[PDB]
Amino acid sequence: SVFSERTEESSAVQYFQFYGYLSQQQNMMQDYVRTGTYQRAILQNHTDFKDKIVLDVGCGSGILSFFAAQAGARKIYAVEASTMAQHAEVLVKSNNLTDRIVVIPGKVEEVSLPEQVDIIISEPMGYMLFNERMLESYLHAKKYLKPSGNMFPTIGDVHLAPFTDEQLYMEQFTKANFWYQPSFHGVDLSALRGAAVDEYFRQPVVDTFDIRILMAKSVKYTVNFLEAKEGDLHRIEIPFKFHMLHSGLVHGLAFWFDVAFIGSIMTVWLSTAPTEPLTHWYQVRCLFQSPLFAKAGDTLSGTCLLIANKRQSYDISIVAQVDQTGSKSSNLLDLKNPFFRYTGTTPSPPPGSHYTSPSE
Amino acid sequence: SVFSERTEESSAVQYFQFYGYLSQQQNMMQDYVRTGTYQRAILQNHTDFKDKIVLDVGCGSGILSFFAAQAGARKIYAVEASTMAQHAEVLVKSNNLTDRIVVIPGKVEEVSLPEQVDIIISEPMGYMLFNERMLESYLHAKKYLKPSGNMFPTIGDVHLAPFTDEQLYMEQFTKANFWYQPSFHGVDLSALRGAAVDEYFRQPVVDTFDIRILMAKSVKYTVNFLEAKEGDLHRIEIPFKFHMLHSGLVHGLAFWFDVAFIGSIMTVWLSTAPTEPLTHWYQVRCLFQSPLFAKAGDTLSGTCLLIANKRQSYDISIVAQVDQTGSKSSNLLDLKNPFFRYT
Amino acid sequence: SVFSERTEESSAVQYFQFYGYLSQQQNMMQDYVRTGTYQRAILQNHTDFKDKIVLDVGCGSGILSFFAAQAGARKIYAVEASTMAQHAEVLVKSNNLTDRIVVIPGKVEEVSLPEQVDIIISEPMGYMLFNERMLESYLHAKKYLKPSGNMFPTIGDVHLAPFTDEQLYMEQFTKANFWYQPSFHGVDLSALRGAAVDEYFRQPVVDTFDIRILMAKSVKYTVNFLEAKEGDLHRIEIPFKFHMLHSGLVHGLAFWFDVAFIGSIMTVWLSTAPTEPLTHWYQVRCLFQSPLFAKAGDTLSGTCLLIANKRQSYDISIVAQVDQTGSKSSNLLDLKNPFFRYT
Amino acid sequence: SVFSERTEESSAVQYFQFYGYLSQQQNMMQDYVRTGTYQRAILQNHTDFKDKIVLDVGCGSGILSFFAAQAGARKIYAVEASTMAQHAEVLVKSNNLTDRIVVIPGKVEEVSLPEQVDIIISEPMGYMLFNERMLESYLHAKKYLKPSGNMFPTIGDVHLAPFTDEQLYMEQFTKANFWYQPSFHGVDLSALRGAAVDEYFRQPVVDTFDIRILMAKSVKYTVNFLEAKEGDLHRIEIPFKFHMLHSGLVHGLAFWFDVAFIGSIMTVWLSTAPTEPLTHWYQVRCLFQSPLFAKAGDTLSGTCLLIANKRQSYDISIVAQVDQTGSKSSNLLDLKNPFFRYTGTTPSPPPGSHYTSPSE
Amino acid sequence: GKAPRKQLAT
Amino acid sequence: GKAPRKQLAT
Amino acid sequence: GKAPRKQLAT
Amino acid sequence: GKAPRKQLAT
Ligand SMILES: *C/C=C/[C@H]1O[C@@H](n2cnc3c(N)ncnc32)[C@H](O)[C@@H]1O
Ligand SMILES: *C/C=C/[C@H]1O[C@@H](n2cnc3c(N)ncnc32)[C@H](O)[C@@H]1O
Ligand SMILES: *C/C=C/[C@H]1O[C@@H](n2cnc3c(N)ncnc32)[C@H](O)[C@@H]1O
Ligand SMILES: *C/C=C/[C@H]1O[C@@H](n2cnc3c(N)ncnc32)[C@H](O)[C@@H]1O
């Protein structure tokens, strides 16, 4: 199948085993922003579902299928590849919906949907939108979408922005400098220091931050799920031309994403921006191995290139230069091995952000 | 090979991917009690190494081989299956020990050592000792061991004792009670309340605890690595009969382990006990879905059974019974999927 | 020279011996708020530096000069009197900024700069702002300043507010009560109880405190570094008239300071206030030997007087008076001998 | 004067200003081991003081003078160079002892004692015994000691021992590795890293430790204050030949000292050993820049050479080698700039010290 | 990756 | 499992 | 004084 | 040095 060709079996095993746990489902359902927005997007576009046929890709607990039923769907085909599919079949029986929701255990690329649906609902967003490569499974499912059918979500908007966070950057060398001692229990570890630095810099940082660490308005790259094909997500070239609004050391690029459910009645937005309430996707920042000096009025240009891998993720290549000085910087990161930095502390504003006397 | 049969690939891939990260090495080496105790045990027993042939099973960054080299070892075969082997080679070259430490990449069940060895050193202890199923690879390396050969560590004592911790029981129980809701966004989740409670309590809890919560003297089950063979660890049956010292709700069993380096000069112990300085192994507590009430002086008997699985871990089965009342508690736990509680 | 007259040698020796230690540099540079705010203020106002001539007074390791260099400065004269100057040179050479940053060792009151400068940058703030008497060296460097020249920082606001802290008062009072003993090993120390109380309360207390202990809006005394001259800081008379917002014992005055980098593009503030993130300056509290009782709405007037001494510090004199009752409190404090309470 | 010749005025100023504070006196008097032992050593050797003439060098608060009076001394000359001398004159007046204790403000090398005393009492011990170079002032005072007079304390015993403390050693590089980052706020600090390492290693560590970190019985170097002359303390060569009892990495040499008050009645000991209750002198450890591997049964030989400086302290040179391997190690330390590491935590025993199962 | 979805505190 | 050895704070 | 700038924990 | 005698806690 198409899924088997692009995924090493070792990746799918650990992947779907993860999603088999009700503790992981619960974590997602308890995300009020995620679950509430999906509920509103469906129930408030009830004409898009009333008496419609619905395909729920990666239904998990089937919670989205129940919202489709709550909106008046006629038949709902709920596809789930993890062993969560049997827990959803329990929910469907006990909610007395066996006549309207049909749980189909298996990967959407492998099951035989019997018919064509009028609308496809799914939650295929990984962190940085593209992780887990479920977007392709969401696009693959369009083989069951009747012509003139809809996709919930309809579009996805990944936002890039350059940030400054000296503490985040200096944390990398602080940790790797463990190896820079000549007599750790009598062993000289220093030869491995450069490797430790490279390892920590290959890691995207998954946490949140204060908006004021950004130094330029965000650049938005848009995937239209109604138009995009599977192969479009294998190579994702995201050119950027940021205009600096703040002077400082650029330490990397911050990422977040929004999706819009463009219904016949109203368009509902689910946004993981740093402006909005925190969601379980947080935000992701990619450091630069070497920071770039840029003043307000310079242009930071470069490309962010995402190359899908057989581990259901993306290899990230970020090149960036300050056009006025030519000083450039590269970095490669493994989206599959992020660093979960979030501690719960409300993010601190960058130093030197007080323009009036705080003592006043 | 021996490894590839008891290990399905998707577990071995994710397993050795984990040890290929230097950050995970740093975490183990920065464990001062662990790293310092290993060095003390080797240096203090330096003639178990002086001009001897050493096999280092799962050498990681090679820190154990360097200790054996400091002790005066003639040759040291440091075997490592993760990509960390390449980082071990760099440290051997930069410490000018190319003439003594030979990094041999691969799984010890698969590699081909040039000669038999006098002593094997390794850190094959997972949390609760038996996780990772690396003790089997450790015992499997005895095929390269001389007859009078030694093992460092030599034995491992796993200690279990019943505990009371209503805070921890309530914490896991209330988590599963999310699935008690009759109307989560209008969706009745109650039917899965069963399955959720079984799931959350299938997880051993990994953190530290004050010993005041232990209600009886610990039971000890010893594994002697000189005398055990690989197949002995496929099934570990640990009977227990606890004489209760305090009344109260028994919420489960608390696990920790000791290992002993029985050398020619002195025996040096490494202990993960709750009274000892904290280590990256912490301790392990297995919760009862429903706790058992025991009076001070009652007897709590049962059996803790460990069956090895293909995921390089164990299916834990704990049955506990207050003999004075017949209050029984049957529990299944998945050692490979623990809940890391420590903050 | 100007420095050697207002500074007796034994103070200057111990003073510059202190800044010659890299560990004391690391402590200042690891102050993220301090180092980050200085960089923001310089980079954000980059054209106050672009192709300009910069004088860095007391450059330490040179971190400010590097910020001025990043901002685009043409030439930067980094002056440093401690042996740290040699470490600044090494960083200039290894950052390939030999063509832009010129380390000139010596005291700024003594060195000979080749040309006048457009902007002076420095960190001349001691705890309570005025300690170290380095603001005088900062103002003294204005002799190299062009007419339209700028100062970074430009001004300093010192804030004082009355506080209540019975825990701190009792802590210092009980310390001095050691000398109340009539029979310490049979020796009557009571005669020195006076002298001990005066000594312990002569020390300003340096730590942080929650703002809930402040009983009135802070008074502000501003020093404008563009307009002040060296001699202005020999005597600092700060009147205050506090309208009390809460009843209770006034145990003394709490001091903190702000400095402002008034650039061409934006003003950036660095604040050591008790509501702001902690910095290595902390805050300073001056205790009353006997506290004053004030009711909510009473007025607490007086004067805080700072007379510069030869030990590169100030003799503080605080008289505080509850106007409604005439309850007066006269205090002498030695800024150079503070009690570092923070733990 | 002799004191002026060997002390830079800047050193004496900060030195005696320190001792002018009653808070510093109080800290010393509240040392129960220090004050109690001195009291016992004097009152329990009452024949050494009864109707005797006493000289109290560096009396401070004059507390030792009061013990001499409590023992029945006829006249006590109490010499104090700091401004604490006037606080002691207050104590003498208010204790109604102006006829038996005479406070003489000034340095013992400069005042005119009018007569010769039968006994000299002082507390001239700095940390590592020799810091502050007050021992020489104590020996200088022997110009007033009648022939066949006594010295309280009579002898001093500095003990050396090699220790192992990987955490202490690794702390040095952890702190200096601050400089080993290429972009600290855009600055490469790494060129200063080696200097930071050298700075931290020039510092003696003043705290306490568990006895089990020692790896060989202590070597004792003895100064007899009745025989020693001033010039003997200008250069202090302390040869050592330790026999290792434990295998491990030697990270330096630990120091502590004892003094004995050898009275006509009984000899009273004041010991700052790690075996004994903590005193305000603590203990002092001098690291090695490079640790030395030694097994139980090797010999660690070398010299500790102390060279007095004009800052009232000593430059410390420690050379040491493992004879069986020839591997040696040097280190230079400034005794005047120690590192006060004590935190209050009861010292941890070295790892691998459990010979029986702790779980038993 | 190990944890596709991250834990969000309740 | 996912993380055989657990992170230990220093 | 003795220590003009005070130690700040990191 | 700066502090000839060290502080001992009471
Ligand atoms: C982020 C949510 C993931 C959910 O969707 C399921 N899932 C992922 N990939 C597939 C494919 N290819 N087919 C069916 N279901 C899929 C995950 O198991 C999870 O429940
Ligand atoms: C707990 C420590 C694990 C270390 O040992 C390595 N390791 C595990 N399993 C094996 C086998 N079978 N052969 C060689 N090395 C092994 C881990 O990679 C880790 O470094
Ligand atoms: C608070 C920062 C002090 C830094 O400035 C240096 N410094 C103090 N006083 C002077 C004078 N008069 N000239 C030059 N540099 C001075 C200190 O050494 C420290 O680095
Ligand atoms: C450790 C105790 C020191 C006390 O003795 C005083 N002191 C030091 N050095 C001298 C000299 N040369 N003459 C008289 N008194 C001295 C210190 O002031 C302190 O009280």
mmCIF file with all atom_site columns, N, CA and C in Angstrom, chain C residues 155-170:
data_model
loop_
_atom_site.group_PDB
_atom_site.id
_atom_site.type_symbol
_atom_site.label_atom_id
_atom_site.label_alt_id
_atom_site.label_comp_id
_atom_site.label_asym_id
_atom_site.label_entity_id
_atom_site.label_seq_id
_atom_site.pdbx_PDB_ins_code
_atom_site.Cartn_x
_atom_site.Cartn_y
_atom_site.Cartn_z
_atom_site.occupancy
_atom_site.B_iso_or_equiv
_atom_site.pdbx_formal_charge
_atom_site.auth_seq_id
_atom_site.auth_comp_id
_atom_site.auth_asym_id
_atom_site.auth_atom_id
_atom_site.pdbx_PDB_model_num
ATOM 1  N N  . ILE C 1 155 ? 20.567 58.509 32.172 1.00 0.00 ? 155 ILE C N  1
ATOM 2  C CA . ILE C 1 155 ? 20.165 58.950 33.497 1.00 0.00 ? 155 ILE C CA 1
ATOM 3  C C  . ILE C 1 155 ? 20.053 57.742 34.412 1.00 0.00 ? 155 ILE C C  1
ATOM 4  N N  . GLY C 1 156 ? 20.016 58.027 35.711 1.00 0.00 ? 156 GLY C N  1
ATOM 5  C CA . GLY C 1 156 ? 19.727 57.024 36.712 1.00 0.00 ? 156 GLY C CA 1
ATOM 6  C C  . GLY C 1 156 ? 18.706 57.499 37.727 1.00 0.00 ? 156 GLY C C  1
ATOM 7  N N  . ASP C 1 157 ? 17.591 56.786 37.839 1.00 0.00 ? 157 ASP C N  1
ATOM 8  C CA . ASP C 1 157 ? 16.577 57.079 38.845 1.00 0.00 ? 157 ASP C CA 1
ATOM 9  C C  . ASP C 1 157 ? 16.812 56.172 40.042 1.00 0.00 ? 157 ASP C C  1
ATOM 10 N N  . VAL C 1 158 ? 17.113 56.760 41.200 1.00 0.00 ? 158 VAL C N  1
ATOM 11 C CA . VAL C 1 158 ? 17.180 56.005 42.447 1.00 0.00 ? 158 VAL C CA 1
ATOM 12 C C  . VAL C 1 158 ? 15.844 56.142 43.164 1.00 0.00 ? 158 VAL C C  1
ATOM 13 N N  . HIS C 1 159 ? 15.246 55.008 43.510 1.00 0.00 ? 159 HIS C N  1
ATOM 14 C CA . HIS C 1 159 ? 13.939 54.972 44.146 1.00 0.00 ? 159 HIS C CA 1
ATOM 15 C C  . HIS C 1 159 ? 14.094 54.519 45.588 1.00 0.00 ? 159 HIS C C  1
ATOM 16 N N  . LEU C 1 160 ? 13.435 55.230 46.495 1.00 0.00 ? 160 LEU C N  1
ATOM 17 C CA . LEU C 1 160 ? 13.404 54.877 47.903 1.00 0.00 ? 160 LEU C CA 1
ATOM 18 C C  . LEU C 1 160 ? 11.958 54.875 48.371 1.00 0.00 ? 160 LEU C C  1
ATOM 19 N N  . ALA C 1 161 ? 11.619 53.905 49.215 1.00 0.00 ? 161 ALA C N  1
ATOM 20 C CA . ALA C 1 161 ? 10.284 53.788 49.780 1.00 0.00 ? 161 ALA C CA 1
ATOM 21 C C  . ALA C 1 161 ? 10.406 53.174 51.162 1.00 0.00 ? 161 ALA C C  1
ATOM 22 N N  . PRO C 1 162 ? 9.550  53.569 52.101 1.00 0.00 ? 162 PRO C N  1
ATOM 23 C CA . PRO C 1 162 ? 9.592  52.964 53.434 1.00 0.00 ? 162 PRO C CA 1
ATOM 24 C C  . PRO C 1 162 ? 9.010  51.562 53.410 1.00 0.00 ? 162 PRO C C  1
ATOM 25 N N  . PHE C 1 163 ? 9.507  50.721 54.313 1.00 0.00 ? 163 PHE C N  1
ATOM 26 C CA . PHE C 1 163 ? 9.106  49.323 54.344 1.00 0.00 ? 163 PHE C CA 1
ATOM 27 C C  . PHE C 1 163 ? 8.869  48.877 55.780 1.00 0.00 ? 163 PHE C C  1
ATOM 28 N N  . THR C 1 164 ? 8.169  47.751 55.911 1.00 0.00 ? 164 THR C N  1
ATOM 29 C CA . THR C 1 164 ? 7.993  47.063 57.182 1.00 0.00 ? 164 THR C CA 1
ATOM 30 C C  . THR C 1 164 ? 8.477  45.629 57.027 1.00 0.00 ? 164 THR C C  1
ATOM 31 N N  . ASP C 1 165 ? 9.354  45.206 57.937 1.00 0.00 ? 165 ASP C N  1
ATOM 32 C CA . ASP C 1 165 ? 9.917  43.863 57.904 1.00 0.00 ? 165 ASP C CA 1
ATOM 33 C C  . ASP C 1 165 ? 10.409 43.487 59.296 1.00 0.00 ? 165 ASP C C  1
ATOM 34 N N  . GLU C 1 166 ? 9.479  43.116 60.181 1.00 0.00 ? 166 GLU C N  1
ATOM 35 C CA . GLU C 1 166 ? 9.847  42.777 61.551 1.00 0.00 ? 166 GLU C CA 1
ATOM 36 C C  . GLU C 1 166 ? 10.815 41.604 61.598 1.00 0.00 ? 166 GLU C C  1
ATOM 37 N N  . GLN C 1 167 ? 10.706 40.677 60.643 1.00 0.00 ? 167 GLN C N  1
ATOM 38 C CA . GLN C 1 167 ? 11.634 39.554 60.595 1.00 0.00 ? 167 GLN C CA 1
ATOM 39 C C  . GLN C 1 167 ? 13.068 40.035 60.400 1.00 0.00 ? 167 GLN C C  1
ATOM 40 N N  . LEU C 1 168 ? 13.278 40.986 59.486 1.00 0.00 ? 168 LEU C N  1
ATOM 41 C CA . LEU C 1 168 ? 14.627 41.495 59.250 1.00 0.00 ? 168 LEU C CA 1
ATOM 42 C C  . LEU C 1 168 ? 15.115 42.342 60.422 1.00 0.00 ? 168 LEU C C  1
ATOM 43 N N  . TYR C 1 169 ? 14.238 43.170 60.998 1.00 0.00 ? 169 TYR C N  1
ATOM 44 C CA . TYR C 1 169 ? 14.641 43.987 62.140 1.00 0.00 ? 169 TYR C CA 1
ATOM 45 C C  . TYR C 1 169 ? 15.041 43.109 63.316 1.00 0.00 ? 169 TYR C C  1
ATOM 46 N N  . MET C 1 170 ? 14.216 42.110 63.627 1.00 0.00 ? 170 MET C N  1
ATOM 47 C CA . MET C 1 170 ? 14.521 41.220 64.736 1.00 0.00 ? 170 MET C CA 1
ATOM 48 C C  . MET C 1 170 ? 15.820 40.464 64.482 1.00 0.00 ? 170 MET C C  1
#
